[model samples]
Target: GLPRELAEAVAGGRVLVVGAGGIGCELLKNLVLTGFSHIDLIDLDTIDVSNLNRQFLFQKKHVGRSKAQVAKESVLQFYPKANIVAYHDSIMNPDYNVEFFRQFILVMNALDNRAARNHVNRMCLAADVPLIESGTAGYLGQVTTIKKGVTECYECHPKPTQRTFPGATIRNTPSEPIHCIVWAKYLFNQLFGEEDADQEVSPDRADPEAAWETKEWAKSTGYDPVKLFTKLFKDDIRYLLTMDKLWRKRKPPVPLDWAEVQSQLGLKDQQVLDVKSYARLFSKSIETLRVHLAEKGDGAELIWDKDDPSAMDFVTSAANLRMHIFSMNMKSRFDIKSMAGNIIPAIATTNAVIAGLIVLEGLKILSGKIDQCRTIFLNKQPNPRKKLLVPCALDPPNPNCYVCASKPEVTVRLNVHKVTVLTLQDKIVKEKFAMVAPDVQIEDGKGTILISSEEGETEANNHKKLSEFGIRNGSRLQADDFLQDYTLLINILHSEDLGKDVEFEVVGDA
Candidate 1:
């Protein structure tokens, strides 16, 4: 549902969007169609053929054209009078100048790479501009808004840093074979018929030999990125020859209009050829070829030879050996940590949803509905109906918080120089130190703890060892047990699960 005044505000403000990729394409399209009159677009990359699968802003003819430019053209086709500004340079470069960003009332971060995102955050913060940042990878995505003073900045949120896996070299293999096979099939479907031809390599055909030859020549001449596949194809031409025959056997010779085959290949409903079946057969053939190479090469006796064994023997012995080794290696490399968030899938999805809600809340603040820092968290697993609300900061600043401390200019500096007899009452100890606070407060129902100048250093050195004091859950203590303390006095709450809240009482030197 749209917030009344905010919806009205949106009708007048200028919006700047920075990215023209997948999520960006979707978001921009939505914005344009929804009547956002002012939009400033910026992206540096051109529209490559690969992006057509998900990005609809550019057509096949527009491949290799600047994505930002194409995206602008696309929006203009729908609303000829739309106010759109398209920039071709990288948004992160300091040379873009602060003034360029100041023009827009709000900015949307649709960028992919983290560097660009961090740069945008820093730039937006510096310019005192509000930002709506969103990102998508696969099926998961996150959206959040940063209102300069109202909420935490991008840095405050957990920003995942780049980390390489321990066995990165082993994990880094050639691109998935199915991707190449699918892409090749797609190209062939576009150029030739979807099914294989009965004839051998011909000039008019989508020749595997020519594709391989062109790939090889590209690598030998200096275009290295596209050459690896050529060498791989050369090594496995025997299996490819078999694949050609398999294609030729299908009805209509092309199979382009065959819906049954397309479904078998994991392709869209409209895909005519069965790509999945082809990939599976090719995978098995490659395995067989690997066995042949091992048997023919030096030290062949040590390697399991698939050709030497019967089909059943190979399935039970050779294949099992490979599967077992693969399973162990996979287990060793990826544990539960690789999956992240309990591998429930919901956690990742929830995090993004929460982030988006945070963005929506920011919009509320911009629309003048709320000026405080508010947060809402949904814990759907434990109880499907519970919603938690946390408001850490309010406009007038809560009376006890650092922002509203009595002595605004002076902070209560904890002193540790005095005599300090610390007793571990019960078994639980919860210590929360305010970066700024009152020296000590004695009020009804509030416990007091002595102020010691040396408390900081002592707590730092002894905090870890103090966890050993075991306090069971249904425990309590009497005040008389700590009446004689020379300095700080505190009660330890009973042991509770991590993240559970507990109250504390601190008695200072009287």
Candidate 2:
């Protein structure tokens, strides 16, 4: 049943599978059964109770264990001859650098995020290794293969950018449920939650150190329900109303009278308000939060978790209060959580089908018939006759792709310790490669930007060694021409036997 050469390649070659989640569990099982003998698996995540529905490699007993380790052990239970090494660590770690990638005959990605996907794509391009990338969301799934020059890299096509709102829209005006939800999460963090190191209120500025100031202000005013209410709703709205230009075309906001709101709803002091009363709900939630803070200490800060009853209660009530002010329809807690969490509906059947397709493409790569590889799409078809799994021809690399276009070459023979960014730019990229005023951006396989031509000081610091930027043997750098819009991939190579002259051999045509 087997062709000798193809079977040998499949049995002997090493394969690396990244991620041990939904697709990974199925992919690992498929890999072992399909004659792939030597396999390496890595996943940063640990098993959770939620993963049991689809990650069949794991059982209820395996909860809280490392996904990579469990998946490997589970697969080996059936295939005793299989040699599977599992890493319970991130694939972006420096240890999984270009050299580590080169050890694999093929790399398969079942990742869920964009950052990790981009890092893998760059490393595979530098290592000249073939990569099979895939993802699933609900009934939809897609898989694609990337070869250095033969196909487009992951970054070749732009991903759907995250939606951002103007500061005024989020702070003073929210016309949609998402706007209010964003404010509750991002803005509310600065007010009452822990200071996120990565959080930014503006593009370059960190969230102002205003949480303490607001608390102090609230304390000075006796911290009454009305005072707290006025500070957020009345005073803040009045401040915005003073900016006449803001409400020129739009309806000016009506500030809430704390007493009028309480009287209108007959809300008694310290009495729990019904969920429908905007002002009472807002005031009660604030009091609940204040009591929570007092009990938990000043160090305690609230973070939005859709599952947490307290957190959901606060966001839902607060968002509705803001909605009532803006005349927008209020959302229920269930709807708010769905919007706030960006939850994608998951299905076990969709994941299993996609994982099977990943192995199909893997076999094509192992058999040295990569030309037959396809970018497949699994669609929801009502009729059996309709092609549910459509295999499309792989598109060539984009001509202007900064990642893989221009056929950039690598020199694995160069000494990374002796070479500096300036020397590499001047000697190799400029003179040898004939690139003009190239804007060279050097980065290692770990996605650290070592040197950027855009930074004038980095060029001046060219006297600094490549190791200064953590570039070692097998490190990868992407050099781009500023004017020509071309990219040159450089791989550092070190050898024990070396002459005085810098040994540089272009990996491909310059």
Candidate 3:
């Protein structure tokens, strides 16, 4: 929320929003009514005959027209004083360079797919432009604001490999499906102008992307949802784009491997490589525990509480139990995996809201009231949709979260054989010595020697384990077993320092 005078100041600056879909429509309406004077819109798709249900600016005749163009016309009609420009192009096009984004103070995203969202993020970062990203699907949506260097970017979010039924089609359109109402609106506008200008094409004629037409009884008989959408509408649009791509000699999309993307964008630093997923899960689990704790009896009734002597211990134990469970769960579940497509829509909406907030924050930035990044969420299925508002820095890759995994920064090589066993002495305690107990490894020449401190175990046991070559837990442990390559580390303490100089006890055949 902003004061009217400050809002007026924002209105005087340029606002650029990418996309004209569900959220775009809402964002534009707000920007205009809020007194934004200069606005620009970019989208490649045209007004389809099906968009009439929710898209307010289009008429029956506006079908087949560029959405950006039509939307621009609509904004101009209401705010003739406002400056509006529209682009009928995709954001992925490399031609959409820094110069294009430089004119605006902030950029808002209302994109549907991950590729485009990521593309915009990379471009914005490179150009030093702030981007506000948002998305909506079904009843769920989210918004976030991203400013390079000043706040967390979209890369901070979990990028799970998305799940999608690549074969599923909407309304007999194979390429991209549009709601029936949207299809109808597109065709209606194209065939019979609401203003009744001129009918350019025959109504009986079908658009390859529209719902299929039947001829047996002047109605179609074949009934397959997949085929209907795929063979007809989806196929047409894909064909169209494919031809366009061929003409332009474009390359196919090759997304970065998940591991690569995570390392470069996911990890905050070397030591923290594996932390984002755990942090997100841990945060959610903590909230659940808090709710459970709040519901417990308030100290007066329970027998456990009746024990005055150990009452504090019980409370402390309960708290610690929850905390440790949360931590253990986080560690066990931290895996580098791809997020399915079904998941991206939710994330996209969340990112969109963040993007919007970023723009809002940009206003603050311009007015010299800069603040930290803000956190927000969207919940449509449950009651009382939740909204979290932590300062941006506390939002992702939590700084204090030591357990949070990120890329490793250092790598250290330890040789158990070289460890000279010594006893703790002179105020030194057992904890002061570095130790990798039995099953620990020490490098010897070109191979590894496994050492065990099991009771009654002998040097013959170690030699036998090593002789069982190809057996699990064999003597040799690769560097990767305990340390990831490209990491920096130092041996703080050696096993020998812990009175475990069993280093010379290796009996493996040379």
Candidate 4:
């Protein structure tokens, strides 16, 4: 709530809104009503049926249209005077550089994923423009302002690396529900989907002394459900119990005895059911999947899809059966689909509240009250203070951060003698450092081109090792990005201790 004098400034402020999804849709609605006349909305996604529930700007008719274009037309239908410039192109496009960012007095990120956020964060800092960032995962949400030199940049704190369960964990003794789901999917391909020799569903392939040759050798059973189940659930599971170390601390899996499983031969439709029902469903689904595979023959078979009822039934029951044997909690069809398909529920309330907060933060910055802005978080439960929306003061820039630091250098520990240049490029610079189209130059050899993002320029260098390029221990590399307008010095540390488990670890605060 401000005077008309300030309203003049608010309506005139040029703001760039990245993304046209959940938060993006809400942000536009709030901005148009809140006297934000000049707006540039950029999103590369199309309207999907999945988006219609939470992204209220879209209707069934708008499906498959550019999100930016549809949202603009929808918003402008009521607020015709607002200058809503919608770009159906991505923010990562080289065209949207620091020079492009200079046009906007403010930038608000309603985008998904950390990569795009990092790009916008770098762009904002380079442009010296204030940015209001917001994101939501179901009920949980966060809103923060990033002002150059005044507040911490988005990459100030390192993101928690994505968790990866080892292949050995999934193949044999699956301790977690996810491991079981992974195994079930692997088993699906082994039966119905295409045959890839490397992606085997068999347990202990390395053991020359194996249980029934392979899951492949099961053609002798004529794809019968009973024999397959007995081999996998009963025999293989029994065989896994022999691995003494796996049973030392954890409860060893109980092989699914035919007599015990005879007891799921029986749902709110979406809800969890009795173990007997799951067993029956597991057998029947296997039979159905087998028939489908036989009719189609080799190469042509039903692909596994979460939306496919038969496939979902198969995965759900199979994963549940393994979970049951492993002593893990059985999950509902709804929960299993979300996990197996890697789905995240979108909440409209979370998006709305976060969008509303973004506008408020924008107002504060535009009204010359940037100092008053704080990083706010919306929690699932009361965060000790009995508050859902908790406000924490904005943190200053992390001095050692590779993005906004005075002199940034990140230490990369790996076996430089063995690892290839391409591995270093993909795993370290692109993945960990979050650099898109990275330009790497070795500090040793007068900074020669070790890896180039440009196509066909350094293609041959990809297969060669870093050490082959005269890159040794204690060498420094300049990983430069033209789009983000940031260059990071990568300090190399060759480690002989790095085993098959890890390639490289980017050791830094950011």
Give lDDT: candidate 3, residue 187. Answer: 26
- Candidate 3 error regions (>4 Å): 1-5, 164-373, 381-510
lDDT of 1 by residue, 43-99 (tens): 988887656776777789998789888898898897887788888878854455457
Task: Point out where model 2 deviates above 4 Å.
Answer: 1-3, 191-234, 248-251, 254-314, 382-385, 407-510
Among all candidates shown, the one with the greatest lDDT: 4
Per-residue lDDT, model 3, residue 109, is: 85
Candidate 3's residue-wise lDDT over 190-277, tens digit each? 3112211122111222333233322121113222222322322334434433433222333321211223323644443212223333
* TM-score of each predicted structure versus truth: 0.40, 0.67, 0.41, 0.77
Order of models, best TM-score first:
4, 2, 3, 1
Of the pair 2 and 4, which is ahead by lDDT? Answer: 4
lDDT string, candidate 2, 341-405, tens digits: 77667778998999999988888888888999999988988346678888898988887554566
* Candidate 4 per-residue C-alpha lDDT over 462-487 given as tens digits, one digit per residue, 9 for 90 to 100: 88999998888898999998888888
Relative to the unseen true structure, what is the C-alpha lDDT of residue 30 in candidate 2, on a scale of 0 to 100? 89
The residue-level lDDT of candidate 3 at 129 comes to 70
- Worst 10 contiguous positions by lDDT, candidate 2: 204-213
Which scores higher on TM-score, 1 or 3?
3
**lDDT score, candidate 1, position 505:** 25
Cα miss at 407, model 1 (Å)? 22
